[PDB]
Design a protein around this ligand. Sequence first.
Ligand SMILES: Cc1cc2nc3c(=O)[nH]c(=O)nc-3n(C[C@H](O)[C@H](O)[C@H](O)COP(=O)(O)OP(=O)(O)OC[C@H]3O[C@@H](n4cnc5c(N)ncnc54)[C@H](O)[C@@H]3O)c2cc1C
Ligand SMILES: Cc1cc2nc3c(=O)[nH]c(=O)nc-3n(C[C@H](O)[C@H](O)[C@H](O)COP(=O)(O)OP(=O)(O)OC[C@H]3O[C@@H](n4cnc5c(N)ncnc54)[C@H](O)[C@@H]3O)c2cc1C
Ligand SMILES: NC(=O)c1ccc[n+]([C@@H]2O[C@H](COP(=O)([O-])OP(=O)(O)OC[C@H]3O[C@@H](n4cnc5c(N)ncnc54)[C@H](OP(=O)(O)O)[C@@H]3O)[C@@H](O)[C@H]2O)c1
Ligand SMILES: NC(=O)c1ccc[n+]([C@@H]2O[C@H](COP(=O)([O-])OP(=O)(O)OC[C@H]3O[C@@H](n4cnc5c(N)ncnc54)[C@H](OP(=O)(O)O)[C@@H]3O)[C@@H](O)[C@H]2O)c1
Lengths: 303, 303
Amino acid sequence: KYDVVIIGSGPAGMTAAMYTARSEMKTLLLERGVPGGQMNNTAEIENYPGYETIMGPELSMKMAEPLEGLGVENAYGFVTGIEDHGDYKKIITEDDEFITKSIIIATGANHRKLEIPGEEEYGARGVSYCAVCDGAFFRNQEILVIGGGDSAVEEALYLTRFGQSVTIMHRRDKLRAQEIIQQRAFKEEKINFIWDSVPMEIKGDDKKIQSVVYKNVKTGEVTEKAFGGIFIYVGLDPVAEFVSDLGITDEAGWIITDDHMRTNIPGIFAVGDVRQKDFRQITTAVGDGAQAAQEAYKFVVEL
Amino acid sequence: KYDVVIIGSGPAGMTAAMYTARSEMKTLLLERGVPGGQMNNTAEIENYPGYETIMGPELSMKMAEPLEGLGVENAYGFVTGIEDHGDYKKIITEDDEFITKSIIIATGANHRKLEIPGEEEYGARGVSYCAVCDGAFFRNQEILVIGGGDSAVEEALYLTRFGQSVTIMHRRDKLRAQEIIQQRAFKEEKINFIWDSVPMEIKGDDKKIQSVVYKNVKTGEVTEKAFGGIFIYVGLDPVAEFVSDLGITDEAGWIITDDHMRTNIPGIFAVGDVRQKDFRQITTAVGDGAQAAQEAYKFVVEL
Ligand SMILES: Cc1cc2nc3c(=O)[nH]c(=O)nc-3n(C[C@H](O)[C@H](O)[C@H](O)COP(=O)(O)OP(=O)(O)OC[C@H]3O[C@@H](n4cnc5c(N)ncnc54)[C@H](O)[C@@H]3O)c2cc1C
Ligand SMILES: Cc1cc2nc3c(=O)[nH]c(=O)nc-3n(C[C@H](O)[C@H](O)[C@H](O)COP(=O)(O)OP(=O)(O)OC[C@H]3O[C@@H](n4cnc5c(N)ncnc54)[C@H](O)[C@@H]3O)c2cc1C
Ligand SMILES: NC(=O)c1ccc[n+]([C@@H]2O[C@H](COP(=O)([O-])OP(=O)(O)OC[C@H]3O[C@@H](n4cnc5c(N)ncnc54)[C@H](OP(=O)(O)O)[C@@H]3O)[C@@H](O)[C@H]2O)c1
Ligand SMILES: NC(=O)c1ccc[n+]([C@@H]2O[C@H](COP(=O)([O-])OP(=O)(O)OC[C@H]3O[C@@H](n4cnc5c(N)ncnc54)[C@H](OP(=O)(O)O)[C@@H]3O)[C@@H](O)[C@H]2O)c1
């Protein structure tokens, strides 16, 4: 009944829906939240070709805007499962079922957790995974960022608008972030580093975070230091629970595809961050999405 | 000496250079002409996520604009050859040589020719391969477009601003273009079709085109019809003469890569339209380019 259903309206899914709709495929785009995906949790995007800089939420709106006019059916849905029935597939959300000839899974990735004490307890009260979301709640605080990657370092740099200081704690003595971002963090006077360290415990009073205990990974030296906020950026897990059973994931839960965005199951494609891959960016999400769309068209024509 | 040299400043090459420069690789971007590549020969771009519509040359400028600020070295160069010397590579232009650790080839594709009589003779005087380039020279003419693909049909639609009428001649009875563009051409009152036909001869007086002779591919019926302009969009050839000898091309001359944009020759990557692939768009060019950039970084770090 749908030619294609796209699950997730981040940049991969929005690109795919734009393309399927231009191919006049009957297109359903399901999203649990706000179109834009991780882009909405991104303050400034510098490396999307075609924009010198642009706020994540503005790029989200620009990507969402033509979709209605092209005849994409945009709908709310949290997807809980998918059944392969041979010549059709069924998609299960909280309340609805949808039948379709093909599926493009574009549901992205989610913050990994430290799984340390205080991490859950300080939940609403000092622990965050989203700096553009929570940054202004930490005006004048000493903020701690955990991680060494693009997200830790960029979001640290963002957070310097708010904090007295921002400290990045990384578990080695060299960051993984893009060098241009490293160099910016090195030069920024409000950014400090705790190298070769991992956090062990997050501590506070009944109401909020007050300190972190951490360990040096080369010496075992243990230190406890006062901080008012902790932002955690230690990498990503796939958001693919609704396909656990289907035999299309690796051990860690990422969706495996070939270079044409095809899974095992014909008519089920995956794009963007949910895929088993190493390079997670808006550019490659958009690329994945275009590719899936064209492959889905081929698949449905040949059905 | 260069960490990476990128040959071609269309969207694939401009994305790649932006990424290598952000990785602080010493980056040379060589282009024979104007940054933008095929985008500069494109009137309206509707399917670049992030823009509802934008003129090709405007998107070109937006993609070129940050490159200088990031420290990309932009230079004129027409590349004539490349030599693999193991731990470095040398690039040969008309006058210069450049030594680099890695190469990203982003030189795109070029219009295929009909190879029919009058095609060369009417060269400057009625035959064109670029509608945004030549369209206004055909105000009030009867224009003929040859081909059935995205480029024939879009550029026909563009040309209706100028011509009394535009006729699309396709060699089958179904277009290959995206359905949304087909539907627009069907509904446009200034567009006519000659189906199941191929052009055989282009004719004119000493000074200009006056008529085309064509043949119906199912009946052999031959017809001659007056037209003032002929725009030819019958597909693409690779622009990769400078690597003919290197064993990285297929029979037709497209550069073969794996899904990480790697050729045979380590440290030589290819991206975008020059690659052996089926799906040629700005989205996948940009995706290819990002991927190559990250792979080149890995390669040069490991050298
Ligand atoms: C802080 C930060 C900064 C970044 N900055 C940049 C940058 O500057 N440049 C760059 O190129 N990349 C950047 N990235 C990476 C980039 O944002 C992602 O690569 C990209 O958004 C991936 O898009 P995607 O469409 O695959 O997934 P996502 O954007 O993750 O979209 C997934 C969507 O699927 C929806 N979804 C999930 N589960 C379900 C379900 N069960 N049912 C229905 N809907 C569901 C989610 O709500 C979401 O909207 C950044 C990432 C982060 C975290
Ligand atoms: C009429 C038309 C309309 C189009 N419309 C759309 C659209 O709306 N949306 C879409 O997604 N795609 C569209 N495309 C396809 C899109 O433009 C291409 O997919 C894309 O530009 C490919 O980019 P690329 O960087 O691989 O190659 P190109 O843009 O082809 O860039 C190649 C560059 O390499 C340079 N170069 C070549 N040889 C050499 C040399 N020997 N030395 C130095 N430099 C060299 C050339 O000057 C050129 O600038 C269109 C194509 C055409 C023809
Ligand atoms: N501008 C952009 O293009 C941009 C922006 C943001 C994100 N992204 C992309 O999005 C993807 C996710 O990025 P990411 O930064 O979230 O994740 P990431 O690349 O996985 O990096 C996570 C970082 O945290 C470190 N880490 C892990 N556990 C730790 C701990 N317990 N204590 C301290 N440090 C710890 C990792 O260490 P090791 O380095 O030792 O593994 C790594 O440096 C990546 O592909 C990234 O490039 C892109
Ligand atoms: N908006 C966009 O995204 C966009 C715009 C333009 C181009 N592109 C992409 O750029 C690439 C090139 O596009 P294209 O349109 O230039 O080439 P194309 O997809 O190769 O199509 C060429 C068309 O001309 C036909 N043809 C070939 N020889 C012919 C002849 N002698 N007489 C009449 N018709 C003839 C072909 O016929 P058959 O169909 O019988 O082969 C085909 O329909 C494609 O991947 C395309 O999708 C994208």
